[PDB]
A paper describes a structure:
Here we report a functional and structural genomics effort that applied saturation-level transposon mutagenesis and next generation sequencing (Tn-seq) to identify essential genes in B. thailandensis, followed by high-throughput structure determination. We used an “ortholog rescue” approach to maximize structural coverage of these gene families, which are likely to be essential not only in B. thailandensis, but also in related, but more virulent, Burkholderia species, such as B. pseudomallei. Using only seven Burkholderia species to select orthologs of essential genes, we solved structures for 49/406 essential gene families, and for 56 total Burkholderia protein targets (including seven ortholog replicates).
Ortholog structures may also be useful in designing broad-spectrum antibiotics with cross-species activity, and by representing a variety of functionally conservative point mutations in the active site may be useful in developing drugs less susceptible to mutations that cause drug resistance.
Residue numbers in the entry:
A (entry chain B): 1 to 408
B (entry chain A): 0 to 408
The structure:
Amino acid sequence: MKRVVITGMGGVTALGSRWDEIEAALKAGRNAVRRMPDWDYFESLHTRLAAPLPGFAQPADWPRKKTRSMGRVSMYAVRASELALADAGFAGDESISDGRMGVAYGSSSGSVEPIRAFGTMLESGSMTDVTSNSYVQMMPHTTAVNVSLFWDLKGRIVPTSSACASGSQAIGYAYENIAMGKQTLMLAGGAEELSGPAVAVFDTLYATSTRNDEPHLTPRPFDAKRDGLVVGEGAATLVLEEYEHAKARGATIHAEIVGFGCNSDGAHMTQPTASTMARAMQLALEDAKLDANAIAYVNAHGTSTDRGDVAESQATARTFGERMPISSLKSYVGHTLGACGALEAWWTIEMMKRNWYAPTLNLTEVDPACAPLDYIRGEARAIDAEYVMSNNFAFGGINTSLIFRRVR
Amino acid sequence: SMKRVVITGMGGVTALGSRWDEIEAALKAGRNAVRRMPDWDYFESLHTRLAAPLPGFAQPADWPRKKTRSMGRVSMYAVRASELALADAGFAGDESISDGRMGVAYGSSSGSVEPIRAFGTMLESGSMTDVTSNSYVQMMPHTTAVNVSLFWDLKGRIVPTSSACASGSQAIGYAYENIAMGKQTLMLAGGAEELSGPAVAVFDTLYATSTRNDEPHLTPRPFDAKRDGLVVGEGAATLVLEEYEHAKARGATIHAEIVGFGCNSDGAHMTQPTASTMARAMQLALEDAKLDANAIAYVNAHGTSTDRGDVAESQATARTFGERMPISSLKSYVGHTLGACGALEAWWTIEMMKRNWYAPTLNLTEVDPACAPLDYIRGEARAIDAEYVMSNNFAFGGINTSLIFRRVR
Ligand SMILES: [Ca+2]
């Protein structure tokens, strides 16, 4: 079995793309949530909150032949992957397209334009905006394919479109593909584009925060006064690479991936089950041949929903006890959906490298319904980790747990 | 210490029926399942009026409402397929499969029509009349995988393989590797699709659809000189994959063993296929099975009946095996069943292998000279006694899959 390391990280997020910009934003303690007055267009959305990207600069040199197939979510994915490849030292590399780099990627949904066009085709038969490019922009695997095609990659495409589990399954399944010798390298990530329908998914479940006048004060993971999540967007990509290969070219190695656990609650489509969530974490620990005691920090899923936070806290307390430091980056960028597992893995590794762990924003009173954990808040925590864990729990009760090993 | 993997359950919902005996009779009777689709006059700009629909489908009566709310048709097909495959594997009424030992790999090209309409219209006009709390789960990329997994309360890993045409074959392949690698003892693996106007527009807008609107019995025509495109079909198919000792220990009837899986992409074009990388996918499978090309007695083509698809596939196959290789396309009967195609074709290929009986490509009367010489079975079924068979599929984005199944005599 091959060992697997991370030699590239990048993305487009509500806090920026470079880590130094993101660190400053984390450190400044304001979230990226805003009012969305344009959503008055939609008939029946309660929430008027989101955490959009502060625009998105499509690079000038991108060729039409390639961009015709991309809506925003695929553009995000590609841009993320471009940044990660540069960071990994592969800018202009001629060899990565030879069939031994593959792509694992997904999103909750394709792009708005073709969803509108195909939906209207059903509604009225009209095909005005249905084109030969509509499917590839809508398709479940739009992100994975667009990323792969963009660098003329010829490896396997692993299409991990599993709503919020998209990015963490990408990482995990890419990791297993390298470990078992199918691919030498993998681009692995997740992405999402913000839209009204993307928000309606959670708003119709009453899972969304409706504090429409106080965007700076919501969401509030594990807080007693939380009232739901806030939807965000963007993408993040990790370059995973077989260990000897990385060593042989003298790559700067950000982390090693040592465990991945994945299961399902098999119970509720939305209402999470703590025991099976805990079991995902155990599976990861078993895969890493580690005791729970080895983990210095957990990066929560931490959506700020009522049941989600309770069930996650119990799952975590069950695996680790009350001593575990934990925080939720969704307090800053919201629930970035398809992107969340990749963005959170990335930032969790950045924090691990620097012995600096961001607090959960807007957590002032720990909800007594949540299990006692070491909820970092108020100020960042200095920890010197050998191992960290990042968890995600998704629609359909799909659970993932990733364990990263420190590399000095 | 890799685990061997066998197939102990097969089933599905298809234009030719569900039971193999029923399907065999249809294959033998040599009529395709293609029909004129007058309803598509509703759509503004479709050239084709052909499809291969299911002749009907009704939910089993004993499916409980609480479990079916989250299903549109494609997920209903997927669940029914998987239900048949589970019975066939001996797991009906057996709840131990829910204990985390069994997982699910599944996908489709698309979610269901209703919520696509509802969300699309929300974008079009802001109206949310028909957007409900159940719309996303019926529309979502992984609707099939999640609905199947939830239906039996399964607690294993979900491997979403929604990759258009490659959905069913990637499901089988990646489920196979999960069992081989020891992550799961069992997996449901399959693919599904529901017929819709939009599903046909995907290919119609590429001019890849047949437009012989008055001659449904005569089209599609894989590898034929007179072919003019594909015909879109629908349905689902599920295989129960199972670790070998586990199967042996409970005395399971074993249909076949999966011995190789190759998966790559062309990295060239979104729709136009590249022969060399298609061949390489076949090689990857052969290498995974530690077999020489010589070992393969038959190839189940993808055989979509498109102009470039059939040429590229033929060359790729000739390049790997030489002119001697027997090959045929089940899409000549049921059309291109999209999400379902890799699973349905895998299933039927194993059924044919078990019986030494290989269906010809329907409506293949003059082999296109632009296609590479292969042993194109046609006119009558061929008797072959195979120790190994291969089933190939090539999809949107240049995604290629090759599966190798070993005879279990
Ligand atoms: Ca290399």
